């Protein structure tokens, strides 16, 4: 359950889970999430902007609880110390690569958490 | 075919299309369109298919039901959560 | 509450003091003549009134050494009902008057494309139960006001029997072609 | 007048009320999905079921009249059970689509479920699935969400006047929509979205972009058509996100046209953001405000008075025209037109000369309407809907000019001006048809008055009105109406500018944002042109100097309706880049030219306006006039000779009629999708 | 180093500037003649 | 009578602002309702602007070359004095 | 059955339909059975006539012809022909 | 009038189908539309003997057929022309002395559209005032009617010359259809209504037609043979006419496979 560094997930096919529902944006107590959406040319609704100010975030996990497709998560990583204030301005590239790097551990933890109610 | 032509717009939900699908790594900051296009069509025996985007509930997306009995026989349909496409078998 | 003091309802006449307004004294007199004498929730004609920076505007806290732009502004007072998208909201609207201030600067800072307000004031709206309350607040804080009055849907006769009416005799000839 | 009881509190209502109407008037809110305050009563859904004593079955509040002495218990447990059961049945087959549904955050299904439903489900079977239909680039369909509420069918039949929607099938497998693959092409089409309570029909341009809770709303009025439609603008930061209709009951009722709703996205592109200057070879360079104003001031000081001219644009407000008129009067200039043809032949001497004297609601009051060169389907779709409603209630429509596919029945009196001459000279049955009518009404389109014989047509119309009884003191009725095409022309007429005063040869032209009806031959090849504007489609290519201005949503201005109503357009977002207000630019130029104007803020400019015309200070109001018969008196010995030329309209493409709409993407999509299908050389004889 | 492409797009989301004519152009009196910038096709002027 | 036959080359516009029903604007209202077409026929091009408001004061505003205006108060003035006021206004 | 028009090459708008003269006499008799202002009431009988003369099925063109004949919108003919199995 | 024969009995039958426009008309609809065209011409002071040039492409089948029947009703003489340059159009206008010219603006002629050629031939059209009559170098030229979508100064749209006259409040009149009135000048030969009717019946006898065989007219429908075996044949006898102008033989065959013993005409020539 540890709440660490945020990441954006994918389906096993490689498709983005996030459908730009903006529930995570309104769930944020710190107003750290900014989202902008346009219809992707194939027709699916995806974010053209999804960024989180990590200097505003309080690491509360309200956004990962609000997500209905388990797209945004808080990973296990805590060694995210930065030398510049601009290194903590997380855009979609950073969250996507964080998800693509930390996917096995996040998947294992989420698998156990899902099986807990069952 | 011209993506701004009447036919191309009409058969693309009135949006300007992109056959190369390589505009989305800049506009949408990812290559998910290419990856989902790499997945072929799933052919289902019945007239309706149920998608949850995974093997179990809560691992994927909420249960959705897609009609495969179309006005034109065998027209594939796309899940609106995951990009998987389904069609009625023959 | 929406439907409920004379001085709050009284609209003072303009007195020209600037050289430009001394030039247009006839226009000031005409505006004093044609504008409504008193303001009530039953009015139909909207109007704009200048701020009254007399002794009555002493209760404002927005006149600081760093801020000389808030006092003297003109607000907008109107009722904002539920929009045309839904009929039964869980929090309904239209039960109060809204006082609103127009935006003063809005842009996008370029490092992350982040929306920024050049004026921290006027970000949120102010809500009052009665129009008299909003006007009294404006008079206290040295604000002018643009008052506009609500428009409501008319009452109409509805019945299911209207769906099934006799077309009339087959011999009704229309001489209008 | 009968006494009923609602939750124990006695109340007095009228015997013609329904239970829903009585409850709403007494402050009691009853959930509903299919009832609408303007459509016919349907009882298909059952969410408005209430509990009444001595009546075993629950009674539908919306579709049941009140009974003297009855008691309505909306807070009993039985009512809660009824609402829970109905909500359960409604949500049994609803798809799990809220995250992807554009109705989320403003869905009546969501709020009603949260407030009145049981709060949890027990249905554990497959839901029905419906294939989506294509209705065009304005309406997006997700038909799994439909609850078969019939609101769209009733709106299309009774308000839009089109008969393309219906319900085909039976039972649970029935489907709402067209039987064949057909677009929902019509004006007022997008309105159906606002009628549908679920995300079944959604605003296709407004797809996935925004959510209800992240928007700020402003009240303002539209300028795309000469009806000042009351609208609500929803924005997020510096970006305007959508436009919705409001309630006025004297303008547009509840509805707006598609151009009003969607052509606002033409303000996001082709914008002029800084002052510019053009070289001889045609190169454009960005310059400072000071340099541009100094150049224009030198030109003004050097140019003779008789060589100075102006053009008044389509989107010109009262303040801008007041500023320009005062400045050019200071420069001893009294000509405000350089164009040879296309001028309105109406005197601005009286307000009744050029206004809609019977107001917008007059179509409900009249029994005979006569259109002269007017096409309401394109020039005022909401007024067209009002006329359709009135024709359903014994209103007869006759038309002189091009036959149009209005959604109601009209009688074609003719095509050319010979019909008007026959009517004016008598020996035509329509003269007696007008005489026997209780309240005759004539609507002449403004376009027919820019004909080379516009004055003669005006005199003929005045003669016809006075002879038949369109204007009469005995009936206290003034049926003469003019349907304008530009807001700026209305404002210029209200201020008192003669539209027929044209400078034949001008060497210095101020174009105050005019792009329509502009041809290179109108402007001399050796003139100096200063164009004040927001878009770069036309006029900006004639200009030696270009000054960026503010759009209608970017300034606090006053607009006069086509019926004479004075309205406030309010600032929603500041103009982009280095643009400035029109009157501020003119005042700065006047100061730099040695003839400063006696006003420094909007208040002093409005004081000057009050000096000119006090009625412009009364907002959302129409000032009555007592000079109708004097203004429209049939003068003796005036020319009434009409050219034997057919009277036509001025609109070809509905979706693109001005610079803002021409610079719109959704307007281009609508053109591409609908212009070929809507074009016909023959009358639809069905209607 | 490619910061301008992101800034320009964000600016153009709500206010795209009009591209002014550059260099020598063609004149018809005082009007300057250029080709239209609309990517959409005016099909009703080519249809028949 | 000769004054109204021709409008002087310095006069540019005659604007009348008054009330619809107030007794103050009674004289100017009646004068406009009787002598408008007499002036308009002799000067078919000269503007004669008439605007009325609910409580506006009666004014006869004369505009000259180079934007010079001369506004005259015309309250409680009968036909003869309205005639004289307009004659003097169009005389300078 | 599907409550919509399936795309069929042999059931398009280009497919012709025309009532026979005997069917026209039957049509005038049926219209005589009903009031002058209620011609639409004859939608159900006329449909049978189509189903009589076109191999026991009703094409889309026949439904459009019926709508034109009865001065009623095509959508109402669609609803009537789809409601009844 | 002979042209109203099918109106007398069973006017609810389908008279003509325009495949290129997906348009089907009954006899009542065709009669009403042609009456509207005739009334619109009459209102503009068109009498017997006036000439109306036709410069229209194949895709405007309904416009051409309505114009032909309306010219028959109104007594004006129809004269089709085939120009591909400004010089040809000027020669046609000089030779015919036509009062009007009905055209399709978007049609191509060399490198320029029809409307561009018309403006080149008549430079007075551009500067013509709104609502004013034409002042051209051609004596009798008064009307330039086009079938297009947009508005061009000096010209009028096709829909703006249609007067759907009412039962009452109608102050116009339509002259009786004369059998000897000229109706067609193509290839320096004159054609009246009587000659066209005789050609219709002769071709019916030779090609073995009756009141049951549909007739498929493809390509250019301005030819007198196409008129005789199409709309004129339908009005005289009740045959079904199908106009498929500007469609290749594959689409024509796909349409004609639904019909039995259809007689096919290509560009006025029996195939
Ligand atoms: S909460 Fe989840 S699905 Fe919604 S906008 Fe955020 S990441 Fe996307
Ligand atoms: S963990 Fe909490 S504070 Fe941080 S982004 Fe998520 S919702 Fe906001
Ligand atoms: S219409 Fe949309 S937001 Fe509304 S409850 Fe249904 S799916 Fe959810
Ligand atoms: S698509 Fe929507 S508005 Fe239309 S009937 Fe269905 S539920 Fe009602
Ligand atoms: S709201 Fe009363 S039955 Fe639908
Ligand atoms: Zn899925």
PDB file of C-alpha atoms in Angstrom, chain D residues 180-388:
ATOM      1  CA  UNK D 180     -32.163   4.783 -42.569  1.00  0.00           C
ATOM      2  CA  UNK D 181     -28.674   6.297 -42.515  1.00  0.00           C
ATOM      3  CA  UNK D 182     -29.559   9.998 -42.604  1.00  0.00           C
ATOM      4  CA  UNK D 183     -27.921  13.035 -41.025  1.00  0.00           C
ATOM      5  CA  UNK D 184     -29.789  15.264 -38.570  1.00  0.00           C
ATOM      6  CA  UNK D 185     -29.176  18.306 -40.755  1.00  0.00           C
ATOM      7  CA  UNK D 186     -31.154  21.372 -39.647  1.00  0.00           C
ATOM      8  CA  UNK D 187     -30.755  24.668 -37.899  1.00  0.00           C
ATOM      9  CA  UNK D 188     -31.352  24.418 -34.142  1.00  0.00           C
ATOM     10  CA  UNK D 189     -30.043  20.843 -34.395  1.00  0.00           C
ATOM     11  CA  UNK D 190     -27.606  21.109 -31.485  1.00  0.00           C
ATOM     12  CA  UNK D 191     -30.490  22.173 -29.251  1.00  0.00           C
ATOM     13  CA  UNK D 192     -31.682  18.556 -29.222  1.00  0.00           C
ATOM     14  CA  UNK D 193     -28.533  17.710 -27.256  1.00  0.00           C
ATOM     15  CA  UNK D 194     -29.600  20.076 -24.481  1.00  0.00           C
ATOM     16  CA  UNK D 195     -32.988  18.362 -24.488  1.00  0.00           C
ATOM     17  CA  UNK D 196     -31.637  14.837 -24.028  1.00  0.00           C
ATOM     18  CA  UNK D 197     -31.117  14.129 -20.300  1.00  0.00           C
ATOM     19  CA  UNK D 198     -28.471  11.438 -20.839  1.00  0.00           C
ATOM     20  CA  UNK D 199     -25.251  11.207 -22.826  1.00  0.00           C
ATOM     21  CA  UNK D 200     -27.079   9.516 -25.690  1.00  0.00           C
ATOM     22  CA  UNK D 201     -26.809  12.714 -27.762  1.00  0.00           C
ATOM     23  CA  UNK D 202     -23.804  14.956 -27.126  1.00  0.00           C
ATOM     24  CA  UNK D 203     -22.215  18.118 -28.500  1.00  0.00           C
ATOM     25  CA  UNK D 204     -19.778  16.695 -31.050  1.00  0.00           C
ATOM     26  CA  UNK D 205     -17.425  19.737 -31.206  1.00  0.00           C
ATOM     27  CA  UNK D 206     -17.520  19.748 -27.381  1.00  0.00           C
ATOM     28  CA  UNK D 207     -16.350  16.135 -27.241  1.00  0.00           C
ATOM     29  CA  UNK D 208     -14.192  15.002 -24.295  1.00  0.00           C
ATOM     30  CA  UNK D 209     -12.625  18.458 -23.923  1.00  0.00           C
ATOM     31  CA  UNK D 210     -14.115  19.686 -20.640  1.00  0.00           C
ATOM     32  CA  UNK D 211     -16.020  18.818 -17.464  1.00  0.00           C
ATOM     33  CA  UNK D 212     -18.821  20.842 -15.841  1.00  0.00           C
ATOM     34  CA  UNK D 213     -17.036  21.611 -12.564  1.00  0.00           C
ATOM     35  CA  UNK D 214     -13.993  23.266 -14.195  1.00  0.00           C
ATOM     36  CA  UNK D 215     -15.916  26.004 -16.029  1.00  0.00           C
ATOM     37  CA  UNK D 216     -16.878  29.587 -15.238  1.00  0.00           C
ATOM     38  CA  UNK D 217     -20.040  30.995 -16.804  1.00  0.00           C
ATOM     39  CA  UNK D 218     -20.933  34.478 -18.034  1.00  0.00           C
ATOM     40  CA  UNK D 219     -24.220  35.922 -19.286  1.00  0.00           C
ATOM     41  CA  UNK D 220     -24.139  37.858 -22.555  1.00  0.00           C
ATOM     42  CA  UNK D 221     -25.893  38.302 -25.905  1.00  0.00           C
ATOM     43  CA  UNK D 222     -25.158  36.999 -29.391  1.00  0.00           C
ATOM     44  CA  UNK D 223     -24.247  39.063 -32.454  1.00  0.00           C
ATOM     45  CA  UNK D 224     -24.136  36.364 -35.155  1.00  0.00           C
ATOM     46  CA  UNK D 225     -27.749  37.171 -36.057  1.00  0.00           C
ATOM     47  CA  UNK D 226     -29.645  40.418 -35.581  1.00  0.00           C
ATOM     48  CA  UNK D 227     -31.756  38.776 -32.889  1.00  0.00           C
ATOM     49  CA  UNK D 228     -29.811  39.411 -29.706  1.00  0.00           C
ATOM     50  CA  UNK D 229     -30.027  35.859 -28.398  1.00  0.00           C
ATOM     51  CA  UNK D 230     -29.383  35.593 -24.666  1.00  0.00           C
ATOM     52  CA  UNK D 231     -26.466  33.192 -24.237  1.00  0.00           C
ATOM     53  CA  UNK D 232     -24.206  31.753 -21.554  1.00  0.00           C
ATOM     54  CA  UNK D 233     -20.475  31.430 -22.236  1.00  0.00           C
ATOM     55  CA  UNK D 234     -18.546  28.724 -20.361  1.00  0.00           C
ATOM     56  CA  UNK D 235     -14.765  29.154 -20.175  1.00  0.00           C
ATOM     57  CA  UNK D 236     -11.774  27.488 -18.525  1.00  0.00           C
ATOM     58  CA  UNK D 237      -8.967  29.958 -17.941  1.00  0.00           C
ATOM     59  CA  UNK D 238      -8.234  31.998 -21.070  1.00  0.00           C
ATOM     60  CA  UNK D 239     -10.106  29.551 -23.348  1.00  0.00           C
ATOM     61  CA  UNK D 240     -13.813  29.796 -24.139  1.00  0.00           C
ATOM     62  CA  UNK D 241     -15.149  26.258 -24.015  1.00  0.00           C
ATOM     63  CA  UNK D 242     -18.840  26.304 -24.954  1.00  0.00           C
ATOM     64  CA  UNK D 243     -21.964  28.393 -25.533  1.00  0.00           C
ATOM     65  CA  UNK D 244     -25.405  27.530 -24.137  1.00  0.00           C
ATOM     66  CA  UNK D 245     -28.823  29.170 -24.494  1.00  0.00           C
ATOM     67  CA  UNK D 246     -30.629  31.109 -21.781  1.00  0.00           C
ATOM     68  CA  UNK D 247     -34.258  31.932 -20.969  1.00  0.00           C
ATOM     69  CA  UNK D 248     -35.722  35.232 -22.127  1.00  0.00           C
ATOM     70  CA  UNK D 249     -39.327  34.531 -23.311  1.00  0.00           C
ATOM     71  CA  UNK D 250     -39.133  37.664 -25.491  1.00  0.00           C
ATOM     72  CA  UNK D 251     -36.007  36.663 -27.445  1.00  0.00           C
ATOM     73  CA  UNK D 252     -35.187  33.105 -28.660  1.00  0.00           C
ATOM     74  CA  UNK D 253     -37.411  31.604 -25.931  1.00  0.00           C
ATOM     75  CA  UNK D 254     -35.091  28.777 -24.856  1.00  0.00           C
ATOM     76  CA  UNK D 255     -33.238  28.025 -28.057  1.00  0.00           C
ATOM     77  CA  UNK D 256     -30.255  29.175 -30.114  1.00  0.00           C
ATOM     78  CA  UNK D 257     -29.246  28.544 -33.708  1.00  0.00           C
ATOM     79  CA  UNK D 258     -26.258  26.395 -34.624  1.00  0.00           C
ATOM     80  CA  UNK D 259     -24.196  29.392 -35.754  1.00  0.00           C
ATOM     81  CA  UNK D 260     -24.722  31.062 -32.377  1.00  0.00           C
ATOM     82  CA  UNK D 261     -23.808  27.878 -30.501  1.00  0.00           C
ATOM     83  CA  UNK D 262     -20.766  26.747 -32.483  1.00  0.00           C
ATOM     84  CA  UNK D 263     -19.270  29.559 -34.585  1.00  0.00           C
ATOM     85  CA  UNK D 264     -17.546  31.032 -31.514  1.00  0.00           C
ATOM     86  CA  UNK D 265     -14.468  28.901 -32.240  1.00  0.00           C
ATOM     87  CA  UNK D 266     -13.670  31.284 -35.093  1.00  0.00           C
ATOM     88  CA  UNK D 267     -12.234  33.614 -32.453  1.00  0.00           C
ATOM     89  CA  UNK D 268      -9.334  31.214 -31.778  1.00  0.00           C
ATOM     90  CA  UNK D 269      -7.625  31.558 -35.168  1.00  0.00           C
ATOM     91  CA  UNK D 270      -6.849  34.059 -37.934  1.00  0.00           C
ATOM     92  CA  UNK D 271      -6.520  36.693 -35.212  1.00  0.00           C
ATOM     93  CA  UNK D 272      -4.815  40.071 -35.535  1.00  0.00           C
ATOM     94  CA  UNK D 273      -2.676  40.462 -32.422  1.00  0.00           C
ATOM     95  CA  UNK D 274      -0.530  43.556 -33.071  1.00  0.00           C
ATOM     96  CA  UNK D 275      -0.582  46.726 -35.188  1.00  0.00           C
ATOM     97  CA  UNK D 276       0.860  46.211 -38.651  1.00  0.00           C
ATOM     98  CA  UNK D 277       1.992  48.261 -41.627  1.00  0.00           C
ATOM     99  CA  UNK D 278       2.097  47.239 -45.287  1.00  0.00           C
ATOM    100  CA  UNK D 279       4.868  48.202 -47.698  1.00  0.00           C
ATOM    101  CA  UNK D 280       4.453  49.010 -51.391  1.00  0.00           C
ATOM    102  CA  UNK D 281       5.489  45.495 -52.432  1.00  0.00           C
ATOM    103  CA  UNK D 282       2.905  44.072 -50.017  1.00  0.00           C
ATOM    104  CA  UNK D 283       5.099  43.033 -47.087  1.00  0.00           C
ATOM    105  CA  UNK D 284       3.555  43.314 -43.622  1.00  0.00           C
ATOM    106  CA  UNK D 285       5.654  44.383 -40.634  1.00  0.00           C
ATOM    107  CA  UNK D 286       4.644  44.491 -36.978  1.00  0.00           C
ATOM    108  CA  UNK D 287       5.020  47.965 -35.465  1.00  0.00           C
ATOM    109  CA  UNK D 288       4.289  49.794 -32.217  1.00  0.00           C
ATOM    110  CA  UNK D 289       1.052  51.544 -31.303  1.00  0.00           C
ATOM    111  CA  UNK D 290       2.778  54.942 -31.171  1.00  0.00           C
ATOM    112  CA  UNK D 291       4.166  54.704 -34.707  1.00  0.00           C
ATOM    113  CA  UNK D 292       0.843  53.605 -36.212  1.00  0.00           C
ATOM    114  CA  UNK D 293      -1.147  56.305 -34.423  1.00  0.00           C
ATOM    115  CA  UNK D 294       1.393  58.960 -35.414  1.00  0.00           C
ATOM    116  CA  UNK D 295       1.248  57.868 -39.065  1.00  0.00           C
ATOM    117  CA  UNK D 296      -2.555  57.980 -39.125  1.00  0.00           C
ATOM    118  CA  UNK D 297      -2.526  61.340 -37.328  1.00  0.00           C
ATOM    119  CA  UNK D 298      -0.161  62.803 -39.922  1.00  0.00           C
ATOM    120  CA  UNK D 299      -2.434  61.485 -42.675  1.00  0.00           C
ATOM    121  CA  UNK D 300      -5.488  63.010 -40.970  1.00  0.00           C
ATOM    122  CA  UNK D 301      -3.759  66.374 -40.560  1.00  0.00           C
ATOM    123  CA  UNK D 302      -2.612  66.415 -44.197  1.00  0.00           C
ATOM    124  CA  UNK D 303      -5.696  65.007 -45.965  1.00  0.00           C
ATOM    125  CA  UNK D 304      -8.448  67.436 -47.033  1.00  0.00           C
ATOM    126  CA  UNK D 305     -11.829  67.010 -45.380  1.00  0.00           C
ATOM    127  CA  UNK D 306     -13.672  66.056 -48.578  1.00  0.00           C
ATOM    128  CA  UNK D 307     -11.261  63.150 -49.220  1.00  0.00           C
ATOM    129  CA  UNK D 308     -11.929  61.337 -45.910  1.00  0.00           C
ATOM    130  CA  UNK D 309     -14.346  58.426 -45.669  1.00  0.00           C
ATOM    131  CA  UNK D 310     -15.349  55.578 -43.405  1.00  0.00           C
ATOM    132  CA  UNK D 311     -16.948  52.149 -43.661  1.00  0.00           C
ATOM    133  CA  UNK D 312     -18.973  50.793 -40.734  1.00  0.00           C
ATOM    134  CA  UNK D 313     -18.499  47.093 -40.097  1.00  0.00           C
ATOM    135  CA  UNK D 314     -20.978  44.340 -39.374  1.00  0.00           C
ATOM    136  CA  UNK D 315     -19.773  43.920 -35.770  1.00  0.00           C
ATOM    137  CA  UNK D 316     -19.636  47.550 -34.663  1.00  0.00           C
ATOM    138  CA  UNK D 317     -20.938  48.515 -31.233  1.00  0.00           C
ATOM    139  CA  UNK D 318     -22.485  51.777 -30.057  1.00  0.00           C
ATOM    140  CA  UNK D 319     -19.355  53.046 -28.293  1.00  0.00           C
ATOM    141  CA  UNK D 320     -17.100  52.493 -31.316  1.00  0.00           C
ATOM    142  CA  UNK D 321     -19.479  54.221 -33.726  1.00  0.00           C
ATOM    143  CA  UNK D 322     -19.964  57.103 -31.283  1.00  0.00           C
ATOM    144  CA  UNK D 323     -16.193  57.549 -31.034  1.00  0.00           C
ATOM    145  CA  UNK D 324     -15.650  57.433 -34.798  1.00  0.00           C
ATOM    146  CA  UNK D 325     -18.580  59.770 -35.484  1.00  0.00           C
ATOM    147  CA  UNK D 326     -17.353  62.317 -32.938  1.00  0.00           C
ATOM    148  CA  UNK D 327     -13.788  62.168 -34.260  1.00  0.00           C
ATOM    149  CA  UNK D 328     -14.752  62.546 -37.922  1.00  0.00           C
ATOM    150  CA  UNK D 329     -17.192  65.339 -37.047  1.00  0.00           C
ATOM    151  CA  UNK D 330     -14.283  67.068 -35.313  1.00  0.00           C
ATOM    152  CA  UNK D 331     -12.383  66.537 -38.577  1.00  0.00           C
ATOM    153  CA  UNK D 332     -15.355  68.101 -40.446  1.00  0.00           C
ATOM    154  CA  UNK D 333     -16.368  64.820 -42.098  1.00  0.00           C
ATOM    155  CA  UNK D 334     -20.008  63.809 -42.559  1.00  0.00           C
ATOM    156  CA  UNK D 335     -19.683  60.826 -44.942  1.00  0.00           C
ATOM    157  CA  UNK D 336     -19.587  57.297 -43.521  1.00  0.00           C
ATOM    158  CA  UNK D 337     -19.686  55.214 -46.711  1.00  0.00           C
ATOM    159  CA  UNK D 338     -17.549  54.856 -49.830  1.00  0.00           C
ATOM    160  CA  UNK D 339     -19.239  51.815 -51.356  1.00  0.00           C
ATOM    161  CA  UNK D 340     -21.235  52.613 -54.484  1.00  0.00           C
ATOM    162  CA  UNK D 341     -24.016  50.028 -54.106  1.00  0.00           C
ATOM    163  CA  UNK D 342     -25.463  47.973 -51.286  1.00  0.00           C
ATOM    164  CA  UNK D 343     -26.528  50.924 -49.127  1.00  0.00           C
ATOM    165  CA  UNK D 344     -29.731  50.814 -47.099  1.00  0.00           C
ATOM    166  CA  UNK D 345     -32.250  53.371 -48.378  1.00  0.00           C
ATOM    167  CA  UNK D 346     -33.823  54.151 -44.998  1.00  0.00           C
ATOM    168  CA  UNK D 347     -33.822  57.533 -43.253  1.00  0.00           C
ATOM    169  CA  UNK D 348     -32.552  57.497 -39.643  1.00  0.00           C
ATOM    170  CA  UNK D 349     -34.831  60.411 -38.768  1.00  0.00           C
ATOM    171  CA  UNK D 350     -37.248  58.285 -36.717  1.00  0.00           C
ATOM    172  CA  UNK D 351     -36.721  55.039 -34.832  1.00  0.00           C
ATOM    173  CA  UNK D 352     -39.871  53.513 -36.355  1.00  0.00           C
ATOM    174  CA  UNK D 353     -38.340  53.911 -39.829  1.00  0.00           C
ATOM    175  CA  UNK D 354     -35.868  51.022 -39.580  1.00  0.00           C
ATOM    176  CA  UNK D 355     -37.038  48.894 -36.637  1.00  0.00           C
ATOM    177  CA  UNK D 356     -39.240  45.882 -35.905  1.00  0.00           C
ATOM    178  CA  UNK D 357     -42.214  47.875 -34.652  1.00  0.00           C
ATOM    179  CA  UNK D 358     -44.241  44.787 -33.668  1.00  0.00           C
ATOM    180  CA  UNK D 359     -41.296  43.219 -31.766  1.00  0.00           C
ATOM    181  CA  UNK D 360     -40.250  39.562 -31.956  1.00  0.00           C
ATOM    182  CA  UNK D 361     -43.406  38.427 -30.141  1.00  0.00           C
ATOM    183  CA  UNK D 362     -45.613  40.132 -32.748  1.00  0.00           C
ATOM    184  CA  UNK D 363     -45.723  36.939 -34.817  1.00  0.00           C
ATOM    185  CA  UNK D 364     -47.864  35.513 -32.010  1.00  0.00           C
ATOM    186  CA  UNK D 365     -50.176  38.546 -32.124  1.00  0.00           C
ATOM    187  CA  UNK D 366     -50.725  38.771 -35.889  1.00  0.00           C
ATOM    188  CA  UNK D 367     -53.022  36.628 -38.023  1.00  0.00           C
ATOM    189  CA  UNK D 368     -51.584  37.417 -41.483  1.00  0.00           C
ATOM    190  CA  UNK D 369     -47.836  37.655 -42.094  1.00  0.00           C
ATOM    191  CA  UNK D 370     -46.365  38.813 -45.409  1.00  0.00           C
ATOM    192  CA  UNK D 371     -42.652  38.275 -46.037  1.00  0.00           C
ATOM    193  CA  UNK D 372     -41.006  40.513 -48.647  1.00  0.00           C
ATOM    194  CA  UNK D 373     -37.532  39.324 -49.616  1.00  0.00           C
ATOM    195  CA  UNK D 374     -37.170  37.585 -46.250  1.00  0.00           C
ATOM    196  CA  UNK D 375     -35.883  34.074 -45.500  1.00  0.00           C
ATOM    197  CA  UNK D 376     -36.453  33.481 -41.768  1.00  0.00           C
ATOM    198  CA  UNK D 377     -35.063  29.933 -41.907  1.00  0.00           C
ATOM    199  CA  UNK D 378     -31.544  31.324 -42.419  1.00  0.00           C
ATOM    200  CA  UNK D 379     -31.719  34.861 -41.002  1.00  0.00           C
ATOM    201  CA  UNK D 380     -33.431  34.040 -37.684  1.00  0.00           C
ATOM    202  CA  UNK D 381     -34.023  30.319 -37.021  1.00  0.00           C
ATOM    203  CA  UNK D 382     -35.478  30.913 -33.545  1.00  0.00           C
ATOM    204  CA  UNK D 383     -37.891  33.488 -34.968  1.00  0.00           C
ATOM    205  CA  UNK D 384     -38.711  30.881 -37.621  1.00  0.00           C
ATOM    206  CA  UNK D 385     -39.548  28.380 -34.872  1.00  0.00           C
ATOM    207  CA  UNK D 386     -41.748  31.006 -33.210  1.00  0.00           C
ATOM    208  CA  UNK D 387     -43.556  31.620 -36.506  1.00  0.00           C
ATOM    209  CA  UNK D 388     -44.047  27.861 -36.899  1.00  0.00           C
TER     210      UNK D 388
END
